[PDB]
Amino acid sequence: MSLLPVPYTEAASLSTGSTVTIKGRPLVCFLNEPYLQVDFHTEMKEESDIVFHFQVCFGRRVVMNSREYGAWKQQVESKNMPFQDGQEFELSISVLPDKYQVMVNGQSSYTFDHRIKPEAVKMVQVWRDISLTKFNVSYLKR
Amino acid sequence: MSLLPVPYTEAASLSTGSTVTIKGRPLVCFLNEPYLQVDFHTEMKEESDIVFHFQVCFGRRVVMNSREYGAWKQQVESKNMPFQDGQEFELSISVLPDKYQVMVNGQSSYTFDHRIKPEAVKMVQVWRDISLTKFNVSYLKR
Ligand SMILES: C[C@@H]1O[C@H](O)[C@@H](O)[C@H](O)[C@@H]1O
Ligand SMILES: C[C@@H]1O[C@H](O)[C@@H](O)[C@H](O)[C@@H]1O
């Protein structure tokens, strides 16, 4: 169905048991190194701090980080690449007690230990070289 | 006036005296490292070879390269950064006898010696984290 705006911004609250579900596809072939970025922000402003930064270079690598009082922290780099050239993906990001868990097409693929409480999140931004059909944050839990 | 599609693709021919003019703006603040990419391709297919690859990480750096029979060649990296945070830019790329010259807001900023004859170009693609208002290739010269 319908394409969502990219960059995509949604005001958001997160806590343990929250799930962020993203369905999209890369705009171009992996040879051209399309990117995907998901940022969990502390304010609606784009320049605000990032509790969780998740950046895919499709076909190549993923980096995760935080941006705290305007400054990037220690980068985690992964060469794990479950994403398939030319294919629609479903990303789900689960807020566990101790970490974010990133599922790609139902497969556990990345985790990132909380550096800031997930309750600090006020906004989620999904951007770079993708089309987006689905975005959901669950709000079912106390 | 009106926003052009991004990624932007135009069938193109280049030779000495050709100018490619691009007016656009970054989608987000430089702190979030928006990218710009301009690729001069040998075919309309996106996977085709790239005579001239020009990739800006806004606020940070520029890399130029070629992709020849599917394989990336020697990277040129520049820390020259005339692009201004939050501002509309005008990029012009001139085909000189021996190189591409990239003007940013009327200022000479990058050059890249021809590795393949500019006559090999069949397509220009402008993409990543920009909006586009103007794209022109000049066709005035023999
Ligand atoms: C400037 C920043 O450096 C950090 O270490 C990276 O994790 C971010 O992706 C960004 O490029
Ligand atoms: C895989 C490629 O490596 C080349 O050296 C770079 O110039 C391209 O931007 C791309 O990242």
Residue A117 is part of a domain; what is its CATH number? 2.60.120.200
With an 8 Å Cβ cutoff, are A127 and B27 in contact? yes
Q: Which residue has the tokens 């750096």?
A: B61
Measured from the CB, is residue B137 less than 6 Å from ligand 2? no
Return d(Cα A52, Cα A110) in angstroms, integer.
12
Rg (CA), chain A: 14
As a residue count, chain A comes to 142
Residues of B in contact with A47 (CB under 8 A): 29, 31-32
Residue appearing with tokens 């990345």: A110
Distance A72 CA to ligand 1 centre (A): 6
Report the gap between the CA of A19 and the closest CA in chain B (Å).
Answer: 24
Tokens 């020849």, residue located: B68
Minimal Cβ distance to A29: which of B27, B28, B47: B47
Distance between terminal CA atoms of chain B? 32
Say how far apart CA B1 and CA B21 lie, in whole Å. 16
Asked whether the beta carbons of residue A35 and residue B35 sit closer than 8 angstroms, the reply is yes
Q: Minimal CA–CA distance to A137: which of A45, A8, A7? A: A8
**Which among B141, B140, B139, B135 is positioned nearest to B2, based on CA atoms?**
B135
Range of the structural domain that residue B50 is part of: 1-142
Name beta bridge partners: B109: none
Closest CA to B66 of B113, B110, B9: B113
Residues paired with A21 in a beta bridge: A92, A136
Rounded to whole angstroms, the Cα distance separating A56 from A27 reads 13
Contact status, residue B19 vs residue B94, Cβ threshold 8 Å: yes
For residue A88, the Cα-to-chain-centroid distance in whole angstroms is: 16
Distance from CA of B125 to the nearest CA of A (A): 11
User: What's the token pair of residue A142?
Assistant: 């106390």
Angstrom distances, CA of residue A56 to CA of A77, A91, B58, B97: 10, 12, 18, 38
Q: Hey, what are A22's tokens? A: 């993203």
Q: Up-side HSE of residue B86: CA atoms within 13 Å toward CB? A: 2
The type of residue at B136 is N
Alpha carbon of residue A11 to chain centroid: 14
- Closest by CA to B118, choosing from B135, B101, B136, B103, is B101
> Solved how?
X-ray
* Interatomic CA distance for residues A43 and A45, integer angstroms: 5
Residues paired with residue B110 on neighbouring β-strands, in sequence order: B102
